[PDB]
Amino acid sequence: AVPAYPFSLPHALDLDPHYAELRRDEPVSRVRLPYGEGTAWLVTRMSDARIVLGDSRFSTAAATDPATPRMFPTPPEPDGVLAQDPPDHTRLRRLVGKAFTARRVEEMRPRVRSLVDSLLDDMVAHGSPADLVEFLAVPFPVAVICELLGVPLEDRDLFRTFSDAMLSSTRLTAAEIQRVQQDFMVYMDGLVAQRRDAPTEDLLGALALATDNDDHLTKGEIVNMGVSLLIAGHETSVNQITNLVHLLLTERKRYESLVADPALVPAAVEEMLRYTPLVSAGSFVRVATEDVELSTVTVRAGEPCVVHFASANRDEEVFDHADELDFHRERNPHIAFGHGAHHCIGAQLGRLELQEALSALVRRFPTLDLAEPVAGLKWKQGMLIRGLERQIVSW
Ligand code: HEM
Numbered sequence: 001a002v003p004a005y006p007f008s009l010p011h012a013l014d015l016d017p018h019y020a021e022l023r024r025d026e027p028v029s030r031v032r033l034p035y036g037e038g039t040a041w042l043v044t045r046m047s048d049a050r051i052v053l054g055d056s057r058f059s060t061a062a063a064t065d066p067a068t069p070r071m072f073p074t075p076p077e078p079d080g081v082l083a084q085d086p087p088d089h090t091r092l093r094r095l096v097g098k099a100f101t102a103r104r105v106e107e108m109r110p111r112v113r114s115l116v117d118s119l120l121d122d123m124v125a126h127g128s129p130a131d132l133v134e135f136l137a138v139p140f141p142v143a144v145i146c147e148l149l150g151v152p153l154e155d156r157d158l159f160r161t162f163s164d165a166m167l168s169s170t171r172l173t174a175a176e177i178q179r180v181q182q183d184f185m186v187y188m189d190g191l192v193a194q195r196r197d198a199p200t201e202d203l204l205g206a207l208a209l210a211t212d213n214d215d216h217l218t219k220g221e222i223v224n225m226g227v228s229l230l231i232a233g234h235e236t237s238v239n240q241i242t243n244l245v246h247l248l249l250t251e252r253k254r255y256e257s258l259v260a261d262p263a264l265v266p267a268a269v270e271e272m273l274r275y276t277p278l279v280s281a282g283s284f285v286r287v288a289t290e291d292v293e294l295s296t297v298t299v300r301a302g303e304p305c306v307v308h309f310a311s312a313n314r315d316e317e318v319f320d321h322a323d324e325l326d327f328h329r330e331r332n333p334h335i336a337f338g339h340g341a342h343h344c345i346g347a348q349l350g351r352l353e354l355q356e357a358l359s360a361l362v363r364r365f366p367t368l369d370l371a372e373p374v375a376g377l378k379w380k381q382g383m384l385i386r387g388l389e390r391q392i393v394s395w
């Protein structure tokens, strides 16, 4: 009876035109998600998005029930941050949030700028043409989160594999993913356990203290924070570097406009954050705990809702010429980093990383162009997020 969401297999970074139709004439529409049972409201507009994400009457904890609609094979892990409601959620985030403040993240620009340069030095050693993914997109975020978290850099292939499986949408089965979660939890649990009598000066260390020094928080929750930070810490930024670079080079003018004014980069990062559907479709589901008014509908208590971040970021009531990509927007109140209690904790880290990668490239490689055809570009399929597996560039 009700439409299947996602509405189509994704292509590149392009939005299904049905989102625009929905925004205009049915901003809160009912849908059938690929897993779980029953039905959920899809929220396509910014005003409503902020209510689902921002309001205390929406619970993510309530979506841990296997019967709830969701975008992924496995029932959500109860111990994950996305599934915690405040105040427990607040305490959990407090454990680690100090290190992610705008101010602390800013402290890293120097380590991060060196790291980027070093990895771009190794790209020039190789010489054009080269795979931007191989040389920059993967190794840069991976190094940063490894050094931040205190995760062995030699284990990249291990945690990348794990992380890719947990961000599966259509690709893997419930059992394959459920398998990987236990391995990953055991891996992380072993990693924090190494600090029982070898305390470290890193997040995993702080995480280890919390497991032997906390009454409010379970060990499952504390350990799962480590896996959430490690998955997110690289999966987002790695794909997001390729996404911005794709958007820049497909219409060379954009890349050209940044070479002209490298101070634009930060605003262009914020723009491309708004434009890009990093989350391919949907979001972690929020279940209403009381009736809640949206634009066109009152969501009833127990009814699930899901948000498409990218569609809210194409809302014509809040962005002028929203279907157009523009680095000179005066205001840009996007929700590329979500909104409310679960606003991404690495928003400042992601920004730092994207700024520094894009700056360095725009300074150093003015003659950067896509050295493979747009048609054969290998976008990743059946994962909850989008990005390229390779990006061969010439200079
Ligand atoms: C370009 C970079 C990034 C983008 C676009 C991005 C996007 C998002 C979005 C949209 C959410 C909201 C999910 C929801 O509430 O339904 C989110 C949550 C999250 N992000 Fe990110 N993110 C980025 C970078 C990072 C980084 C670098 C880390 C970690 C180092 C990270 C860790 C997280 C975590 C843990 C959450 C969930 C926290 C919670 O449940 O409260 N993200 N991110």
Ligand SMILES: CC[C@H]1OC(=O)[C@H](C)[C@@H](O)[C@H](C)[C@@H](O)[C@@H](C)C[C@@H](C)C(=O)[C@H](C)[C@@H](O)[C@H]1C
Residues within 6 Å of the ligand: 071, 072, 080, 082, 166, 167, 227, 228, 231, 232, 236, 279, 282, 283, 284, 384, 385
């Ligand atoms: C339905 C789409 C979402 O994926 C999920 O909910 C996944 C099942 C989460 O368990 C993933 C693996 C967690 O590690 C996140 C903390 C990663 C972080 C980057 C995000 O929050 C991300 C935006 C995420 O919410 C969306 C991709």
